[PDB]
Amino acid sequence: GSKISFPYLGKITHLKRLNHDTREIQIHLSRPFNYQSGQFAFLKIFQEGFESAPHPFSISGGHGQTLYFTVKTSGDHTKNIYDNLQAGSKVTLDRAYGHMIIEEGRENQVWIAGGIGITPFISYIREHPILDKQVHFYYSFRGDENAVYLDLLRNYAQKNPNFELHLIDSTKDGYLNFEQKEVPEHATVYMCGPISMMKALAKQIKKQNPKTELIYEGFKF
Ligand SMILES: Cc1cc2nc3c(=O)[nH]c(=O)nc-3n(C[C@H](O)[C@H](O)[C@H](O)COP(=O)(O)OP(=O)(O)OC[C@H]3O[C@@H](n4cnc5c(N)ncnc54)[C@H](O)[C@@H]3O)c2cc1C
Ligand SMILES: [Cl-]
């Protein structure tokens, strides 16, 4: 307990409904905030009609006094977020958490995202406009209407040729599968999506390419 730490006080400045069920929150904080792309944080909302309990969400962009989250409806709080959350509202955050720093991974990196699991990588893309690493990125989503940030990703491919982008619509091709997929020899694979999808892909990637490093963060929708 050798540090006195105060929560990060914030105001919500902008919101955008990216699709039918996912909403992007832009926050201004009272003082600069440390994180590294791939970490999450615990957000507490103070608006009439909202529970103020802390929910974790992956940080999906920002530096300094700007922080972004992208929320997919999955239950009542998130549904309330999509529907009713309002610019002006006060929020606090404790601090960054997680062991998924994309910076610290190898030169070579494979990225796998299922659904709203793309958020941590949007973080990376947003804060590294020119890309240093070598990236194969697999974005899996259930139907075009569950994809987000498409334009941002395509713009990023155009600016960064060392950025290689695969869009899988799982309803077209079936769940992503890495059995007959090879992996760069000295690569780090990062993954984020439904827990069910993580565990299945971990299995497939530790067996085919058992020499690969693999960091993931699951959740349930
Ligand atoms: C590290 C991490 C990062 C994350 N990042 C993100 C992110 O970037 N974006 C994002 O949208 N989410 C993210 N999540 C998930 C998010 O934290 C939760 O999904 C969210 O806080 C749930 O809030 P809720 O009240 O809407 O869900 P709840 O209503 O609490 O329920 C959650 C789930 O449980 C089920 N459920 C609800 N009520 C009941 C009941 N009475 N009985 C049985 N089952 C029930 C629902 O089907 C629902 O899907 C992350 C989670 C983790 C752990
Ligand atoms: Cl799951």
Author numbering: 179 to 399
Task: Reproduce passages from the article.
NADPH oxidases (NOX) are transmembrane proteins, widely spread in eukaryotes and prokaryotes, that produce reactive oxygen species (ROS). The cytosolic dehydrogenase (DH) domain belongs to the Ferredoxin NADP +Reductase (FNR) family which has motifs to bind a flavin cofactor and a pyridine dinucleotide NAD(P)H. Thus, the NOX core catalytic domain contains the necessary machinery to move electrons from the electron donor – NADPH – through the flavin and heme cofactors to the ultimate electron acceptor, molecular oxygen, to make the ROS product. SpNOX purifies as a monomer and is constitutively active, so it represents the minimal functional core shared by all NOX family members. Here, we obtained X-ray structures of WT and F397W mutant of DH-only, and of a F397W mutant of full-length SpNOX.
To solve the SpNOXDH WT structure, we used the SpNOXDH F397W structure as a model, and achieved 2.5 Å resolution. As expected, SpNOXDH presents a typical fold of the FNR superfamily of reductase domain containing two sub-domains, the FAD-binding domain (FBD) and an NADPH-binding domain (NBD). Both WT and F397W SpNOXDH display 3 molecules per asymmetric unit and the two structures are identical. In the asymmetric unit of SpNOXDH WT, one of the three molecules contains no flavin. In the wild type, the isoalloxazine ring is sandwiched between FBD residues P234 and F235 on its si-face, and the NBD residue F397 on its re-face. Superposition of the different SpNOXDH WT molecules from the crystal asymmetric unit shows that the F397 aromatic ring imperfectly occupies the position in front of the re-face of the isoalloxazine ring, with orientation 40° with respect to the plane of the isoalloxazine ring, and distance at 5.3 Å. Phe in this position, however, leaves more space in this pocket and the sidechain has more degrees of freedom, making it feasible for the nicotinamide to displace it and transfer hydride to the isoalloxazine. The DH domain shows almost no contact with the ribitol and adenosine parts of the FAD. With the exception of possible polar contact of the first phosphate group with the backbone of the protein, the rest of the FAD molecule points out into the solvent, in the direction of the missing TM domain. From these observations, WT SpNOXDH could well behave as a flavin reductase, able to use different flavins as substrate through the sole recognition of the isoalloxazine ring. In contrast, the SpNOXDH retains constant affinity equal to that of lumiflavin (~10 μM) regardless of the flavin analog. These results suggest that the isolated DH domain binds to FAD primarily at the isoalloxazine ring of the cofactor, and the addition of ribitol (riboflavin), phosphate groups (FMN), and adenosine nucleotide (FAD) do not further interact significantly with the isolated DH domain.
